[PDB]
């Protein structure tokens, strides 16, 4: 009862015969309509792959006190705010990963250059010892 | 016969063209941007002035069409045996449990750093400026907002034209039918 | 709400997403972000609307 | 009841319908309109009685 | 709006009780007259199983274009699932990027410690050269 | 059978009470109830007319 896509409790969990994972039927069918392929195994997937399954439903909060409710606008604002902040963290992660990859590239390149430095220094030192 | 070997000798050249391979642009996602020269002077505190040449090497590839600053190309080049041999030395010493420990440390720490702040303040946690950070960044956001709004507005007039072509007709027909027809039938 | 609106008393909700606040405090940044995201969603919806066109409109008229 | 199959009736959105105010303002206005209809039918019931 | 028996649209529609299907009155009464069976699902059907249309009613019909609170809420829900799908995909991309961040991080940490050790060895080499 | 459960790359968020679905379903149920009221009073109205 831990969704691997968002973490929210799935109200209609289903099981898969090839690789059972925690999803809900509707978004699986929507993805198959967009792309009728298995996301994990990169193989053809069909609508009949999933067997029906029963669920016991959940409880609801029912916001009380009935004051000419304008909250919907602010709550929508906060949901969009969360997704915008998430986009921000995504851009930061891409920038930092590319910077890290370049840093690794010329770290290893300088490593090789100083390998050549060390090899020549040891060669010269041992030849001086040899003389 | 000649071409039967020549196009293979041509096919050799493209297979020979793989003898020089680099990264970042190998998959070409994002990039250290365009304003390189100022950052190197800003670089505080051996490996920081180090990335500056590869970032200068990145201007060799067509990413320079975005913008060019300073240039000063300092490409040192490489060799395949160099690349291959360093992959062994890098990975021969660097055991799966620490990776689990590594994943825990970074993910938390990332959530600790990525607090619910619209501008990135992790670096600003050490500087002393917060108002000006909001000024430039999200005047820049607004300017892009205005450009996108203008481009979409250019797309609104076609929408408005097709919708004065359609919606007025639909509304006239719907009102004219529904009201008179329905309220007449009830009397009949 | 009926005892309210018997004298009309039109309900009021925040319409302050067009003022587009000049550089200020966190309200201006929050406003900029919400305008940007609404604008992105708007563009997506229009491109979707003319992915098909007025065929649904023809079916509605029929 | 039996689930029958229909092509379903499409709803062409107005020129201004992209969430945002283009939806919240129209939601508010339609609320006011249905409220006005509620009164125009209550008071009419009473007058007819 | 299409009939399976003939392929033409039914001029006077009728819905079959045993199986949901839109027929035209003449052909459906034809298939009932010839036998008490369903032409589609091969199950018993009768004249009473044919449901005529009582569309008029008495309430005010409503426009399936703009003035429907269910339509407004359905548009809100479509926006809700659209932003949910966006969050889904970007969260998946984010965890993949976190994997590659951590891999590159420990690889560079190992590279830095090896660089320190190497520079120690080169310092030893310089010492060896200067001892002469 | 169902294999070992897989909570991974989730950072679980507890099921907080204050949420949107609740408001949406509240508004929807309100609309169904008000429509039933409209039906009731329109039948009474046509009978009284």
């Amino acid at each position: 009862m831990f969704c691997s896509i968002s973490g929210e409790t799935p109200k209609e969990p289903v099981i898969s015969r090839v690789s059972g994972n925690v999803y809900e039927k509707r978004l699986i069918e929507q993805v198959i309509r967009e792309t009728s392929k298995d996301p994990v195994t990169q193989q053809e997937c069909t609508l009949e792959d999933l067997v029906p399954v029963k669920v016991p439903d959940f409880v609801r909060p029912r916001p009380p006190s009935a004051t000419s409710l304008p909250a919907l606008l602010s709550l929508f604002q906060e949901e969009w705010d969360s997704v915008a902040l998430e986009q921000f963290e995504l851009r930061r992660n891409l920038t930092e990963t590319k910077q890290e990859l370049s840093t690794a590239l010329y770290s290893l390149d300088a490593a090789l250059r100083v390998i050549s430095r060390l090899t020549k220094e040891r060669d010269e030192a041992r030849e001086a010892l040899a003389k | 016969d000649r071409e039967r070997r020549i196009q293979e000798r041509i096919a050799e050249k493209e297979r020979l063209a793989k003898a020089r391979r680099s990264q970042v642009i190998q998959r070409d996602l994002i990039r250290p941007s365009v304003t390189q020269p100022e950052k190197w002077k800003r670089s505080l505190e051996l490996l920081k002035e180090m990335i500056a040449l590869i970032s200068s090497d990145a201007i060799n590839y067509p990413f320079g069409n975005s913008k060019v600053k300073g240039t000063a190309n300092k490409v040192p080049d490489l060799s395949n045996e160099e690349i291959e041999r360093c992959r062994l030395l890098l990975k021969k010493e660097i055991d799966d449990y620490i990776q689990f420990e590594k994943e825990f440390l970074e993910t938390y720490s990332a959530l600790h750093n990525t607090s619910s702040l619209l501008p990135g303040l992790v670096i600003y946690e050490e500087d002393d400026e917060d108002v000006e950070a909001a000024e430039k960044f999200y005047t820049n956001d607004i300017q892009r907002d205005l450009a996108k709004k203008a481009l979409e507005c250019n797309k609104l007039e076609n929408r408005v034209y097709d919708l004065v072509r359609s919606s007025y007709e639909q509304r006239n027909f719907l009102i004219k039918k529904i009201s008179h027809a329905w309220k007449a039938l009830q009397t009949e | 709400v009926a005892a309210g609106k018997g004298e009309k008393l039109a309900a009021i909700d925040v319409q302050r997403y067009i003022q587009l606040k000049p550089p200020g405090t966190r309200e201006s940044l929050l406003q900029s972000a919400v305008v940007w995201e609404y604008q992105k969603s708007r563009n997506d919806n229009l491109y979707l609307l003319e992915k098909h066109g007025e065929k649904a409109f023809d079916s509605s008229l029929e």
Side-chain angles (χ1 to χ4, degrees), chain A, chain B, chain C:
Chain A
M1 204 45 60
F2 287 159
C3 191
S4 62
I5 320 164
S6 62
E8 198 261 334
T9 74
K11 282 193 282 186
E12 199 166 36
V14 300
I15 70 163
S16 175
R17 283 182 54 190
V18 172
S19 73
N21 196 286
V22 295
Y23 319 110
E24 310 150 21
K25 213 198 185 294
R26 272 196 205 177
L27 72 162
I28 289 180
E29 308 317 280
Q30 200 270 330
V31 170
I32 296 306
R33 291 272 69 72
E34 297 176 359
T35 51
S36 187
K37 280 192 69 174
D38 189 358
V40 297
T41 57
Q42 205 82 13
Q43 190 46 282
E44 289 289 322
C45 189
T46 73
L47 305 179
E48 281 265 10
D49 197 61
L50 299 166
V51 71
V53 56
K54 320 307 294 179
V55 75
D57 212 353
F58 287 157
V59 59
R60 296 178 188 171
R62 88 213 168 279
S65 66
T67 77
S68 61
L69 184 56
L72 199 82
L73 164 71
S74 308
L75 319 181
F76 276 19
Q77 286 293 75
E78 187 270 297
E79 304 326 304
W80 289 106
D81 273 328
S82 67
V83 71
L85 301 168
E86 201 92 358
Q87 303 215 358
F88 184 70
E89 76 188 7
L90 294 174
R91 67 177 289 280
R92 312 302 267 210
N93 265 35
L94 279 68
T95 54
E96 67 198 16
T97 186
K98 298 295 181 288
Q99 288 187 209
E100 176 151 56
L101 192 147
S102 295
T103 306
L105 310 163
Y106 194 41
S107 301
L108 62 92
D109 269 358
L112 295 181
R113 289 175 62 178
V114 72
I115 297 299
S116 305
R117 289 182 184 171
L118 170 69
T119 56
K120 288 190 174 180
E121 290 169 357
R122 281 211 307 254
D123 287 359
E124 190 161 4
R126 293 182 183 174
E127 178 70 84
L129 188 159
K131 196 263 182 184
Chain B
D1 279 33
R2 268 178 186 168
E3 190 74 7
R4 182 44 260 179
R5 301 291 92 225
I6 279 295
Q7 56 71 16
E8 182 270 334
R9 301 284 151 220
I10 302 299
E12 177 37 79
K13 161 64 50 166
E14 299 78 59
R15 296 171 292 216
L16 183 138
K18 71 182 178 293
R20 323 287 300 183
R21 295 177 69 187
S22 55
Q23 291 203 345
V24 298
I25 309 167
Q26 203 172 38
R27 293 182 183 174
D28 58 359
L29 312 179
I30 305 297
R31 201 145 288 127
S33 301
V34 296
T35 48
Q36 288 180 24
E38 179 177 358
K39 277 63 183 172
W40 313 147
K41 317 157 193 169
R42 184 55 53 90
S43 174
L44 296 174
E45 303 171 350
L46 70 164
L47 301 175
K48 300 182 185 176
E49 304 184 3
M50 175 283 285
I51 66 185
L53 316 183
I54 313 304
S55 295
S56 82
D57 302 350
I59 319 177
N60 83 330
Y61 285 162
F63 182 71
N65 301 357
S66 310
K67 205 173 194 186
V68 291
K69 297 296 188 184
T71 306
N73 280 4
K74 286 149 182 176
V75 191
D77 273 344
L78 288 176
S79 311
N80 289 157
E81 284 183 345
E82 296 165 359
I83 303 175
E84 303 177 355
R85 290 183 181 180
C86 183
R87 296 313 175 89
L88 290 73
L89 69 86
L90 175 79
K91 279 190 171 182
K92 269 172 163 295
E93 301 168 354
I94 193 180
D95 205 21
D96 295 279
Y97 296 101
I98 189 60
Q99 293 177 335
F100 273 39
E101 174 174 353
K102 287 265 179 46
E103 289 279 357
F104 193 96
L105 295 168
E106 189 65 346
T107 47
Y108 274 57
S109 295
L111 309 170
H112 305 347
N113 297 318
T114 58
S115 175
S116 183
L117 315 165
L118 302 103
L121 194 147
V122 191
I123 309 179
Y124 292 85
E125 279 160 1
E126 191 280 327
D127 298 333
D128 319 305
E129 199 177 18
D130 50 354
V131 182
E132 194 41 58
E135 211 284 336
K136 292 154 33 64
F137 208 87
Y138 304 106
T139 58
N140 292 17
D141 212 35
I142 291 174
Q143 295 151 13
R144 300 190 192 179
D145 286 5
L146 306 181
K148 197 177 181 177
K149 286 159 193 164
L151 291 171
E152 292 143 343
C153 283
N154 304 334
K155 296 175 179 177
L156 293 203
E157 292 303 338
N158 65 7
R159 295 329 162 87
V160 173
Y161 186 81
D162 306 330
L163 285 163
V164 176
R165 265 305 175 176
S166 292
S167 166
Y168 157 76
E169 291 79 6
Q170 164 264 333
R171 290 176 183 178
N172 181 19
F173 303 150
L174 199 163
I175 297 296
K176 182 178 180 179
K177 182 262 182 183
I178 201 73
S179 68
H180 294 88
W182 199 230
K183 74 207 182 202
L185 174 70
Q186 322 310 289
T187 79
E188 315 316 315
Chain C
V1 299
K5 55 167 160 286
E7 284 57 51
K8 293 179 179 179
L9 298 190
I12 305 294
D13 198 346
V14 185
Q15 314 290 329
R16 275 73 177 272
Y17 304 143
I18 317 162
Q19 293 173 357
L20 283 156
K21 275 190 173 182
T25 58
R26 295 252 167 259
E27 279 56 49
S28 70
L29 308 91
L30 190 67
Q31 189 268 293
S32 177
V34 300
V35 163
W36 159 257
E37 58 200 356
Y38 284 132
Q39 199 42 269
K40 191 200 69 177
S41 180
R42 173 174 151 295
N43 201 351
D44 277 18
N45 306 336
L46 284 72
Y47 179 77
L48 171 81
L49 176 64
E50 306 274 16
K51 184 196 141 287
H52 52 84
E54 267 65 24
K55 303 173 188 174
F57 178 82
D58 310 340
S59 48
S60 161
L61 277 66
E62 297 273 5

